[PDB]
RNA sequence: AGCGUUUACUUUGAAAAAAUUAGAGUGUUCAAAGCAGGCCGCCUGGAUACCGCAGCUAGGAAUAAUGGAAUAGGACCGCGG
């Protein structure tokens, strides 16, 4: 969103749903952002980092936010690939 | 379900689907080697025959035509032919 | 009966996108559909696609991204002259910045940008933006 | 020699050697009556990936069916002769150019590019027949074909996958992967 | 949907991918051609020859066992009947309905169904006229339609 | 110099009265207009585009019609003629 000069000119950049690739508007109060914790390989304890996921309002009320979060977690390697 | 592997369906799902509504349509029918209780010669019979298949020399009659699959007479072993 | 095949192909993509599917099944594939979808892909509105090949009209499984708003056909296929591309893409496309009109020229099937580039008219098939 | 070429030209000492290896095999093997009227057209030698090669032999279309009858028993004998080089038999089909406006009968649709390319891919993988095809159109615009073969003759054919892909690439210029699927038979 | 009905029936054949003839079948092109000749000369339509083969002898499809379609085998040999075996069956039905209707005069339903069958005869007859299977003079007329069996 | 399944489509070229319209030049004192003018005899303009459809002409061959061998009276190649 830049002019011929190359100054980024629009006032902000809206987050995009991690599942459907829709953009989460200013007055979309049914959207989420869920931080899933990271485990240290050997100890089994919380590191202090996490894999954050944003999801659109339409996806949630459709009822695919569950299976969407599941696929994103399974792709990031949080959930086992056998499952 | 939003994400479904349309290219690689598991056999049970596309074994269930209507024979035309599969990805590559295939018949639910087959040919079967079927023999009489007395004689040694075998006869090739279609799954959904729709004629009366007489044992060669009309020694007896093998199948009977119905709505769907052809009813093979009692006391006739069969082995479905595969390629 | 099925009189326009590209019309139903693009409507089935459009419903699949709106509904929020990751991929879609197009039934009766053709050169014009595959040549439409390669133009879409080349700008990056759809991902890859795989044309399933029975001994009939094939089938296409298209990997949808969520960066396509509308893909629509124009029937009948009007004879768009070069001096008419502007007044077509003025009322069909959303802005002068994004969106494309694919039209079947002598060169092949391509968007209004390349038809202007090669100095060619043709016939409008559809649009995607 | 048993190598009649469609043009009245002379067989390169290469394919003469192959058609004279067929003279030797005819005069010796149980296959003597079969390799009598059966002829060869040509034999090319192509270098596939890794460090291997394949000898690709051209049969007249009508005689292919009679060659298919004996091929596995013959391929065995010619592979035990030619040390570490695969051999595959292909019926030679004429490919007539699409009639344009600049410029004769109705070009028979058996003699068209799509038809002969499907015929070439059928004649390559002889014993293990085709059950499925899928053309993965990659993101750049390039295509990759994926041929699903018959699962019976897996271990009979699965060692010639890289060879088949390399030969078909040389003939047509089309990228092929070879799968054995698991959800039909 | 059906031509002359409100039904939307989905019930027909589903050919397999593999056009190759299976290994168990020992009947060659000439053996089934001798069989087709014998069945047609007995007095039997291309349809009934096809079912007889696949039921009893185990011939998946004749176009794969042979290289021809049953009628192209029969019309090459000169055993093909003149007026086709679907036009034949439509005329045969139309005569059967009219013979019923000549007796049972108040059968308003048989009158309506006869009109539908005849609309189908005309519509298929003109297809065969354009494709030069019939003469341009060929007529379906209920006066002397029974002359055609 | 000739020949080369037809047709729509598309791009090019030709042929297309001025006036009006769009439009380049120019201080009618400005402007509507006008085709004039400008420099110490000389120097200069009076352009250019637009003109559907039908007809003419030359490239392109995607799209949509249409034709070729199936009683073989088929194409080609040669010999009797």
XYZ file of C-alpha atoms (C1' of nucleotides) in Angstrom:
710
model
C 0.000 0.000 0.000
C 2.769 2.473 -1.116
C 2.874 5.342 -3.717
C 5.380 5.682 -6.672
C 7.928 7.063 -4.078
C 7.708 3.940 -1.806
C 6.339 5.518 1.453
C 3.880 3.082 3.208
C 0.918 5.503 3.156
C -2.247 3.674 4.507
C -2.617 4.116 8.313
C -2.475 0.364 9.356
C -2.438 -3.283 8.037
C -5.319 -5.540 9.259
C -4.449 -9.119 10.467
C -5.477 -12.013 8.138
C -7.307 -15.168 9.439
C -4.757 -18.069 9.771
C -7.369 -20.514 8.255
C -9.465 -18.835 5.465
C -7.045 -15.923 4.538
C -9.878 -13.308 5.044
C -8.859 -9.983 6.754
C -10.149 -9.363 10.348
C -11.890 -5.915 10.331
C -11.885 -3.164 13.034
C -15.465 -4.018 14.282
C -15.177 -7.873 14.024
C -15.719 -8.837 17.733
C -16.222 -12.624 17.005
C -12.533 -13.045 15.835
C -9.816 -14.573 18.156
C -6.000 -14.670 18.625
C -4.938 -17.823 20.597
C -1.294 -18.333 21.806
C -0.455 -22.114 22.057
C 2.540 -22.647 24.466
C 5.920 -24.234 23.426
C 7.316 -27.266 25.410
C 11.092 -27.901 25.983
C 11.957 -31.235 24.227
C 13.513 -33.142 27.223
C 12.066 -31.535 30.452
C 8.407 -31.176 29.251
C 8.244 -27.575 30.667
C 7.062 -24.228 29.121
C 9.953 -22.416 27.268
C 8.503 -18.849 27.102
C 7.592 -18.894 23.328
C 4.261 -19.829 21.581
C 2.608 -20.329 18.112
C -0.102 -17.570 17.843
C -3.149 -18.121 15.497
C -5.731 -15.460 14.393
C -9.192 -16.725 13.160
C -12.084 -14.837 11.391
C -15.582 -14.338 12.942
C -17.433 -16.191 10.098
C -15.180 -19.339 10.514
C -15.944 -19.458 14.319
C -19.799 -19.211 14.024
C -19.678 -21.721 11.066
C -17.953 -24.083 13.598
C -14.683 -24.844 11.669
C -12.455 -22.811 14.136
C -11.859 -26.157 15.994
C -10.746 -28.232 12.912
C -8.867 -25.110 11.557
C -6.825 -24.653 14.844
C -6.223 -28.490 14.719
C -4.766 -28.321 11.121
C -2.580 -25.221 11.969
C -1.230 -26.963 15.162
C -0.645 -30.272 13.216
C 1.234 -28.279 10.460
C 3.377 -26.331 13.054
C 4.307 -29.754 14.627
C 2.576 -29.109 18.037
C 0.100 -32.046 17.523
C 1.534 -35.515 16.536
C 1.219 -36.376 12.779
C -0.366 -39.806 13.695
C -2.914 -38.121 16.109
C -14.920 -29.987 7.101
C -13.431 -27.140 4.931
C -10.096 -28.945 4.200
C -10.816 -32.361 2.529
C -8.253 -34.285 0.364
C -10.425 -34.332 -2.848
C -7.522 -35.905 -4.889
C -6.783 -38.806 -2.408
C -10.051 -40.168 -0.894
C -9.640 -43.338 1.305
C -11.113 -46.520 -0.312
C -14.181 -46.840 2.062
C -15.567 -43.340 1.113
C -15.318 -43.887 -2.726
C -16.422 -47.577 -2.319
C -19.594 -46.059 -0.672
C -20.216 -43.280 -3.319
C -22.669 -43.885 -6.249
C -20.774 -45.618 -9.134
C -20.932 -42.399 -11.328
C -20.210 -39.892 -8.435
C -16.702 -41.415 -7.741
C -13.543 -39.545 -8.981
C -12.972 -42.048 -11.864
C -16.344 -43.891 -12.349
C -16.072 -47.747 -12.145
C -18.741 -50.522 -12.249
C -19.976 -52.249 -9.008
C -20.372 -55.480 -11.140
C -17.962 -58.375 -12.049
C -17.641 -61.759 -13.885
C -17.570 -65.067 -11.880
C -16.350 -68.606 -12.804
C -19.351 -70.782 -11.654
C -19.668 -74.637 -11.838
C -22.482 -77.263 -11.408
C -22.562 -79.997 -8.677
C -22.181 -82.840 -11.285
C -20.135 -81.497 -14.277
C -16.432 -80.345 -14.333
C -16.615 -77.571 -17.039
C -17.036 -73.999 -15.603
C -19.173 -71.115 -17.064
C -18.397 -67.325 -17.029
C -21.535 -65.478 -15.679
C -22.080 -61.666 -15.313
C -22.954 -60.384 -11.759
C -26.227 -58.727 -13.026
C -26.912 -61.369 -15.782
C -30.628 -60.580 -16.724
C -30.824 -63.813 -18.882
C -31.131 -67.518 -17.808
C -27.597 -69.030 -18.333
C -28.160 -72.766 -19.180
C -25.278 -75.232 -18.383
C -23.862 -76.157 -21.857
C -26.105 -78.932 -23.330
C -28.945 -77.674 -20.989
C -27.771 -80.218 -18.307
C -29.261 -77.649 -15.815
C -29.700 -73.804 -15.404
C -27.075 -71.772 -13.404
C -28.506 -68.229 -12.724
C -31.982 -66.548 -12.531
C -32.605 -62.847 -13.440
C -33.992 -60.437 -10.726
C -33.977 -56.643 -9.941
C -30.197 -56.312 -9.275
C -27.674 -59.227 -9.017
C -28.586 -62.551 -10.766
C -29.513 -65.285 -8.188
C -27.239 -68.370 -8.709
C -29.132 -71.686 -8.030
C -28.440 -73.655 -4.773
C -25.545 -76.203 -4.992
C -23.306 -74.204 -7.449
C -19.882 -72.940 -6.150
C -18.465 -69.754 -7.835
C -15.073 -67.888 -7.874
C -15.294 -64.196 -9.033
C -12.797 -63.485 -11.909
C -10.348 -60.517 -11.447
C -7.911 -58.578 -13.762
C -28.875 -28.714 -20.144
C -25.110 -27.817 -19.897
C -24.790 -25.154 -22.694
C -21.923 -23.098 -21.063
C -19.201 -25.247 -19.311
C -16.881 -22.300 -18.279
C -19.958 -20.569 -16.655
C -20.570 -23.549 -14.261
C -16.779 -24.069 -13.631
C -16.378 -20.406 -12.433
C -19.702 -20.414 -10.415
C -18.572 -23.643 -8.569
C -15.130 -22.006 -7.783
C -17.004 -18.841 -6.571
C -19.363 -20.790 -4.182
C -16.396 -22.932 -2.880
C -14.353 -19.710 -2.167
C -17.321 -17.905 -0.432
C -18.094 -21.068 1.662
C -14.368 -21.129 2.710
C -13.188 -24.460 1.144
C -9.406 -25.116 0.621
C -9.997 -26.916 -2.759
C -12.940 -27.577 -5.193
C -13.944 -30.181 -7.890
C -14.710 -28.887 -11.467
C -16.555 -31.674 -13.424
C -16.406 -31.272 -17.276
C -12.878 -29.804 -17.894
C -11.876 -28.274 -21.300
C -8.932 -26.395 -22.974
C -10.790 -23.034 -22.362
C -11.236 -23.851 -18.574
C -7.559 -25.050 -18.169
C -6.451 -21.939 -20.200
C -8.700 -19.704 -17.949
C -7.312 -21.290 -14.694
C -3.619 -20.974 -15.863
C -4.230 -17.163 -16.371
C -5.785 -16.998 -12.806
C -2.817 -19.023 -11.339
C -0.172 -16.935 -13.263
C -1.277 -13.824 -11.204
C -1.809 -16.089 -8.118
C -5.575 -16.157 -7.277
C -5.632 -20.029 -7.261
C -2.690 -22.303 -6.233
C -1.816 -25.448 -8.284
C -4.542 -27.694 -9.853
C -4.544 -31.367 -11.047
C -6.735 -32.401 -14.074
C -8.005 -35.987 -13.269
C -8.041 -37.914 -16.608
C -10.775 -40.580 -17.194
C -11.653 -41.669 -20.828
C -14.330 -38.850 -20.989
C -14.371 -35.091 -20.229
C -11.793 -34.880 -17.357
C -12.204 -33.399 -13.820
C -10.097 -30.596 -12.155
C -9.253 -30.318 -8.392
C -8.147 -26.632 -7.867
C -6.148 -25.637 -4.700
C -8.020 -22.439 -3.585
C -6.217 -19.656 -1.664
C -8.353 -16.975 0.124
C -7.256 -14.069 -2.172
C -10.052 -14.342 -4.863
C -13.159 -12.078 -4.375
C -15.134 -12.871 -7.603
C -14.517 -14.929 -10.810
C -17.406 -14.483 -13.330
C -18.130 -15.408 -17.012
C -19.626 -13.104 -19.744
C -22.108 -15.026 -22.010
C -22.591 -14.247 -24.820
C -18.908 -13.930 -25.964
C -19.070 -10.355 -27.448
C -16.526 -9.167 -30.100
C -14.422 -6.766 -27.902
C -12.459 -4.407 -30.252
C -9.159 -2.931 -28.851
C -10.774 0.586 -28.551
C -13.538 -1.040 -26.321
C -11.217 -2.756 -23.688
C -11.372 0.487 -21.567
C -15.236 0.793 -21.498
C -15.472 -3.008 -20.733
C -12.817 -3.024 -17.903
C -14.309 0.324 -16.602
C -17.665 -1.330 -15.546
C -16.571 -5.050 -15.101
C -13.443 -4.592 -12.861
C -13.488 -3.097 -9.302
C -10.532 -0.624 -9.756
C -7.777 0.442 -12.268
C -5.188 -1.196 -9.871
C -6.211 -4.937 -9.609
C -8.635 -7.292 -11.468
C -8.300 -8.815 -15.001
C -10.556 -9.481 -18.074
C -9.390 -12.738 -19.800
C -10.420 -12.597 -23.525
C -9.815 -15.222 -26.296
C -7.625 -13.490 -28.990
C -5.854 -14.968 -32.102
C -2.602 -15.154 -29.991
C -4.389 -17.300 -27.317
C -6.425 -16.743 -24.077
C -4.942 -13.793 -22.051
C -5.887 -10.711 -19.903
C -6.591 -7.081 -21.095
C -2.995 -6.052 -20.040
C -1.283 -8.467 -22.549
C -3.991 -7.828 -25.265
C -3.069 -4.071 -25.019
C 0.676 -5.100 -24.942
C 0.472 -7.174 -28.220
C -2.076 -4.679 -29.812
C -4.924 -7.266 -30.267
C -8.748 -7.489 -29.879
C -10.758 -10.746 -29.456
C -13.818 -12.052 -27.504
C -14.471 -11.607 -23.710
C -14.759 -14.963 -21.796
C -14.894 -13.691 -18.165
C -13.127 -11.685 -15.391
C -11.410 -12.394 -12.002
C -10.540 -9.807 -9.253
C 19.123 -58.700 -41.884
C 15.644 -58.584 -40.173
C 15.776 -54.703 -39.858
C 13.677 -53.209 -42.746
C 13.591 -49.346 -42.444
C 10.621 -47.384 -43.926
C 13.051 -45.273 -46.069
C 15.494 -47.220 -48.338
C 18.541 -46.339 -46.118
C 21.064 -48.605 -44.277
C 21.037 -49.751 -40.603
C 23.783 -48.140 -38.406
C 26.160 -50.915 -37.098
C 24.378 -50.337 -33.697
C 20.773 -51.471 -34.587
C 22.171 -53.985 -37.181
C 23.886 -55.603 -34.115
C 20.438 -55.687 -32.337
C 18.633 -57.165 -35.441
C 21.616 -59.630 -35.820
C 21.248 -60.457 -32.056
C 17.595 -61.253 -33.115
C 19.041 -63.436 -35.994
C 21.109 -65.332 -33.316
C 18.094 -65.603 -30.887
C 15.679 -66.750 -33.700
C 18.109 -69.483 -34.970
C 18.758 -70.729 -31.326
C 15.775 -70.119 -28.930
C 12.321 -71.841 -28.661
C 11.234 -68.464 -30.219
C 12.341 -69.457 -33.808
C 8.899 -69.707 -35.587
C 7.793 -66.373 -33.917
C 10.863 -64.272 -35.048
C 10.480 -65.321 -38.778
C 8.222 -62.627 -40.408
C 8.496 -60.332 -37.282
C 10.833 -57.377 -38.202
C 12.413 -54.330 -36.407
C 12.273 -50.709 -37.774
C 15.064 -48.980 -35.720
C 16.873 -49.042 -32.301
C 18.076 -45.801 -30.545
C 20.334 -45.725 -27.394
C 19.588 -42.948 -24.793
C 21.404 -41.992 -21.517
C 19.004 -41.766 -18.469
C 19.807 -40.134 -15.057
C 22.258 -41.721 -12.550
C 24.738 -43.584 -14.821
C 22.472 -45.965 -16.855
C 21.206 -46.276 -20.498
C 18.168 -47.781 -22.363
C 17.969 -49.314 -25.918
C 14.537 -48.251 -27.371
C 13.427 -50.541 -30.289
C 10.831 -49.533 -32.978
C 8.261 -52.170 -34.205
C 5.718 -51.847 -37.089
C 2.199 -51.107 -35.590
C 0.519 -54.344 -36.898
C 3.437 -56.569 -35.631
C 3.410 -54.953 -32.081
C 0.588 -57.343 -30.906
C 2.775 -60.355 -32.016
C 5.831 -58.673 -30.294
C 3.762 -58.057 -27.059
C 2.942 -61.852 -27.203
C 6.713 -62.676 -26.680
C 8.186 -59.378 -25.256
C 8.952 -60.368 -21.566
C 10.547 -63.715 -22.735
C 12.543 -61.741 -25.426
C 13.443 -58.676 -23.188
C 14.905 -61.279 -20.704
C 17.213 -62.789 -23.429
C 18.252 -59.336 -24.879
C 18.863 -57.922 -21.301
C 21.058 -61.007 -20.434
C 23.001 -60.172 -23.698
C 23.277 -56.303 -23.438
C 25.091 -56.048 -20.047
C 23.534 -53.304 -17.795
C 21.153 -51.489 -20.230
C 17.282 -51.720 -20.101
C 15.369 -52.511 -23.385
C 11.731 -51.436 -24.191
C 9.680 -52.019 -27.430
C 7.487 -49.217 -28.971
C 5.247 -49.466 -32.115
C 6.330 -46.672 -34.562
C 3.238 -44.439 -35.219
C 3.151 -41.610 -37.850
C 2.149 -38.169 -36.385
C 0.480 -36.010 -39.116
C 0.634 -32.176 -38.724
C -2.689 -30.339 -37.893
C -4.146 -28.929 -41.173
C -3.926 -25.054 -41.085
C -5.453 -22.397 -43.472
C -2.284 -21.888 -45.663
C -2.758 -25.627 -46.595
C -5.194 -34.588 -48.925
C -7.855 -36.570 -46.915
C -9.353 -36.260 -43.362
C -6.250 -36.784 -41.106
C -7.239 -40.034 -39.283
C -7.434 -39.180 -35.523
C -5.273 -42.304 -34.739
C -2.467 -40.252 -36.501
C -2.717 -37.171 -34.138
C -0.217 -36.033 -31.413
C -2.528 -36.546 -28.333
C -3.421 -40.099 -29.611
C 0.169 -41.322 -30.461
C 1.588 -39.803 -27.168
C -1.106 -41.813 -25.230
C -0.133 -44.869 -27.418
C 3.664 -44.365 -26.696
C 2.945 -44.219 -22.885
C 0.799 -47.438 -23.222
C 3.533 -49.301 -25.254
C 6.451 -48.312 -22.868
C 5.071 -49.927 -19.653
C 3.897 -53.101 -21.493
C 3.262 -55.842 -18.834
C 1.973 -53.520 -15.997
C -0.985 -51.654 -17.673
C -2.213 -48.050 -16.882
C -5.223 -47.654 -14.451
C -5.037 -43.830 -13.805
C -3.459 -40.538 -15.056
C -3.293 -37.063 -13.358
C -1.560 -33.969 -14.925
C -0.296 -31.771 -11.997
C -0.152 -28.222 -13.535
C 2.733 -26.663 -11.470
C 2.464 -22.974 -10.344
C 4.888 -21.679 -13.101
C 2.614 -23.138 -15.897
C 4.654 -26.356 -16.602
C 2.830 -29.769 -16.408
C 3.839 -33.115 -14.762
C 1.850 -36.316 -15.694
C 1.447 -39.063 -12.982
C 0.718 -42.580 -14.436
C -0.921 -45.048 -11.950
C 0.148 -48.568 -13.177
C -1.465 -52.012 -12.453
C -0.369 -53.117 -8.905
C 0.211 -56.724 -10.150
C 3.687 -56.630 -11.850
C 4.843 -54.071 -9.178
C 8.198 -55.873 -8.459
C 8.263 -57.044 -12.170
C 8.268 -53.343 -13.392
C 9.104 -50.999 -10.376
C 12.923 -51.177 -11.176
C 12.359 -49.481 -14.652
C 10.555 -46.293 -13.294
C 13.555 -43.877 -13.795
C 14.288 -45.544 -17.221
C 10.612 -45.187 -18.424
C 10.530 -41.470 -17.316
C 13.913 -40.839 -19.086
C 12.844 -42.596 -22.372
C 9.346 -40.915 -22.563
C 11.110 -37.531 -21.890
C 13.475 -38.179 -24.896
C 10.597 -39.208 -27.290
C 7.820 -36.640 -26.458
C 9.303 -34.109 -23.936
C 6.685 -34.624 -21.141
C 7.652 -35.094 -17.415
C 6.233 -38.374 -15.892
C 6.183 -39.928 -12.368
C 5.126 -43.645 -12.038
C 2.920 -44.713 -9.039
C 1.468 -48.113 -7.939
C -1.844 -47.238 -6.151
C -3.273 -49.234 -3.165
C -7.112 -48.576 -2.948
C -8.514 -50.543 -6.012
C -6.647 -53.936 -6.310
C -34.508 -35.157 -17.333
C -36.650 -37.521 -19.515
C -37.865 -36.126 -22.926
C -41.662 -36.690 -22.328
C -41.848 -37.076 -18.478
C -41.173 -35.022 -15.282
C -38.698 -37.697 -13.946
C -34.926 -37.028 -13.416
C -33.711 -40.687 -13.344
C -29.942 -41.350 -12.907
C -29.616 -45.092 -13.840
C -27.219 -46.151 -16.688
C -23.966 -48.175 -17.277
C -20.529 -47.184 -15.817
C -17.631 -48.444 -18.065
C -14.310 -49.103 -16.224
C -11.096 -47.044 -16.887
C -9.046 -50.003 -18.315
C -10.217 -50.604 -21.961
C -7.807 -53.657 -22.096
C -9.468 -57.136 -22.526
C -8.887 -59.372 -19.429
C -6.592 -62.489 -19.501
C -9.312 -65.154 -18.726
C -11.181 -64.332 -22.028
C -9.989 -66.787 -24.785
C -12.601 -65.626 -27.422
C -10.666 -63.825 -30.266
C -12.000 -61.076 -32.664
C -12.990 -63.673 -35.367
C -14.605 -66.136 -32.824
C -16.996 -63.404 -31.426
C -17.559 -62.162 -35.065
C -18.677 -65.759 -36.011
C -20.858 -65.709 -32.794
C -22.397 -62.237 -33.661
C -23.119 -63.432 -37.288
C -24.891 -66.610 -35.926
C -26.997 -64.590 -33.359
C -28.033 -61.856 -35.909
C -28.946 -64.520 -38.588
C -31.060 -66.383 -35.912
C -33.080 -63.075 -35.745
C -31.858 -60.776 -32.921
C -31.135 -56.982 -32.497
C -27.620 -55.509 -31.828
C -28.824 -54.904 -28.183
C -29.834 -58.597 -27.588
C -26.564 -59.873 -29.264
C -24.556 -57.659 -26.809
C -26.335 -58.953 -23.614
C -26.161 -62.656 -24.824
C -22.320 -62.230 -25.181
C -21.646 -60.558 -21.747
C -24.114 -62.847 -19.797
C -23.182 -66.328 -21.196
C -19.737 -66.063 -22.961
C -18.244 -63.300 -20.693
C -17.421 -60.565 -23.302
C -17.085 -57.291 -21.243
C -17.569 -55.053 -24.362
C -17.352 -56.056 -28.101
C -15.586 -52.708 -28.987
C -12.534 -53.951 -26.902
C -12.638 -57.731 -27.851
C -13.189 -56.717 -31.540
C -12.240 -53.215 -32.869
C -15.833 -52.527 -34.140
C -19.338 -51.755 -32.725
C -21.896 -54.642 -33.206
C -23.875 -52.727 -35.945
C -20.625 -51.808 -37.876
C -19.724 -55.590 -37.828
C -23.278 -56.436 -39.094
C -23.581 -53.574 -41.715
C -20.034 -54.439 -43.053
C -21.166 -58.130 -43.412
C -24.533 -56.863 -44.854
C -26.709 -58.356 -42.024
C -27.847 -54.870 -40.752
C -31.676 -54.442 -41.003
C -32.731 -51.378 -43.135
C -34.754 -49.145 -40.690
C -32.849 -48.878 -37.332
C -33.662 -50.969 -34.171
C -34.871 -47.938 -32.079
C -37.035 -46.303 -34.857
C -38.394 -49.903 -35.395
C -39.308 -50.263 -31.649
C -41.001 -46.767 -31.510
C -43.199 -47.605 -34.612
C -43.953 -51.113 -33.128
C -45.132 -49.501 -29.802
C -47.137 -46.731 -31.638
C -49.032 -49.439 -33.692
C -49.674 -51.437 -30.424
C -51.157 -48.290 -28.677
C -53.318 -47.323 -31.750
C -54.679 -50.945 -32.107
C -55.734 -50.797 -28.376
C -57.167 -47.236 -28.873
C -59.253 -48.195 -32.014
C -61.273 -50.551 -29.669
C -61.276 -48.687 -26.272
C -62.543 -45.340 -27.722
C -62.931 -43.346 -24.407
C -59.222 -44.043 -23.459
C -58.205 -40.309 -23.274
C -54.870 -41.350 -21.587
C -53.902 -43.778 -24.454
C -54.774 -40.881 -26.887
C -52.337 -38.518 -25.010
C -49.553 -41.211 -24.740
C -49.937 -42.078 -28.503
C -49.343 -38.317 -29.329
C -46.115 -38.413 -27.151
C -44.742 -41.621 -28.871
C -45.470 -40.192 -32.408
C -43.750 -36.837 -31.512
C -40.715 -39.081 -30.594
C -40.966 -41.075 -33.940
C -40.973 -37.824 -36.071
C -38.089 -36.353 -33.958
C -35.820 -39.476 -34.413
C -36.965 -40.108 -38.067
C -35.719 -36.590 -39.119
C -32.301 -37.191 -37.358
C -31.874 -40.389 -39.509
C -32.979 -38.404 -42.664
C -30.202 -35.743 -42.119
C -27.590 -38.517 -41.365
C -28.676 -40.340 -44.634
C -29.787 -43.621 -42.886
C -33.309 -43.089 -44.447
C -34.455 -41.654 -47.826
C -35.686 -37.990 -47.782
C -39.158 -39.389 -48.857
C -39.460 -41.708 -45.735
C -42.791 -40.953 -43.931
C -44.333 -42.128 -40.617
C -48.121 -42.291 -41.370
C -50.519 -44.369 -39.143
C -52.593 -45.210 -42.326
C -49.876 -47.691 -43.574
C -47.363 -47.727 -40.634
C -48.308 -51.431 -39.911
C -46.663 -52.339 -43.314
C -43.430 -51.612 -41.333
C -43.461 -54.567 -38.819
C 3.659 -13.962 -62.809
C 0.179 -18.703 -60.590
C -1.719 -22.137 -57.257
C -3.383 -23.509 -52.386
C -12.074 -26.096 -47.628
C -15.377 -21.732 -47.074
C -17.416 -18.145 -43.120
C -17.703 -14.794 -38.648
C -13.839 -12.658 -35.423
C -9.477 -9.465 -34.742
C -5.288 -5.952 -36.360
C -3.360 -3.248 -40.718
C -3.763 -0.505 -45.484
C -6.732 1.816 -49.163
C -11.159 4.902 -50.388
C -13.599 8.162 -47.872
C -16.993 16.508 -49.694
C -16.782 20.925 -46.964
C -19.232 23.228 -42.733
C -20.140 21.597 -37.471
C -17.623 18.678 -33.333
C -12.673 17.374 -30.962
C -8.228 19.673 -31.866
C -2.284 22.341 -32.917
C -0.586 27.572 -34.134
C -1.911 32.968 -33.564
C -2.863 38.913 -27.610
C -9.671 39.629 -32.829
C -7.506 45.306 -26.392
C -9.897 39.975 -23.590
C -13.793 36.583 -25.176
C -17.571 34.535 -28.740
C -15.469 34.278 -33.279
C -11.718 34.835 -37.491
C -7.764 32.263 -40.642
C -4.950 34.955 -40.165
C -0.050 36.782 -39.260
C 5.353 37.830 -37.728
C 10.626 40.594 -38.447
C 14.029 44.348 -39.560
C 11.636 43.436 -48.808
C 12.164 38.991 -45.891
C 10.009 34.866 -42.882
C 5.624 32.014 -42.255
C 0.799 29.202 -41.599
C -3.906 27.624 -43.490
C -2.132 21.078 -39.346
C -4.001 16.540 -37.041
C -7.590 13.275 -35.305
C -13.082 11.446 -35.787
C -16.469 9.594 -40.062
C -20.781 3.727 -37.345
C -22.859 -0.564 -40.819
C -22.095 -2.577 -46.006
C -18.078 -3.035 -50.043
C -12.281 -3.334 -51.099
C -7.166 -5.123 -49.316
C -3.146 -7.710 -46.280
C -1.462 -10.323 -41.500
C -3.276 -13.757 -36.994
C -5.631 -18.612 -36.200
C -7.728 -18.769 -29.775
C -13.083 -18.817 -29.936
C -18.007 -20.358 -32.904
C -20.131 -22.487 -37.396
C -18.828 -25.788 -42.053
C -16.230 -29.821 -45.415
C -13.323 -34.533 -46.486
C -12.617 -42.267 -47.028
C -17.644 -46.368 -44.293
C -21.889 -49.842 -50.872
C -14.819 -47.566 -50.674
C -16.906 -44.884 -56.790
C -10.410 -43.345 -51.008
C -5.161 -40.646 -51.682
C -0.652 -41.668 -53.936
C 2.450 -44.532 -57.370
C 3.235 -46.766 -61.641
C 1.888 -50.174 -66.410
C -2.981 -51.465 -71.000
C -4.816 -47.975 -72.852
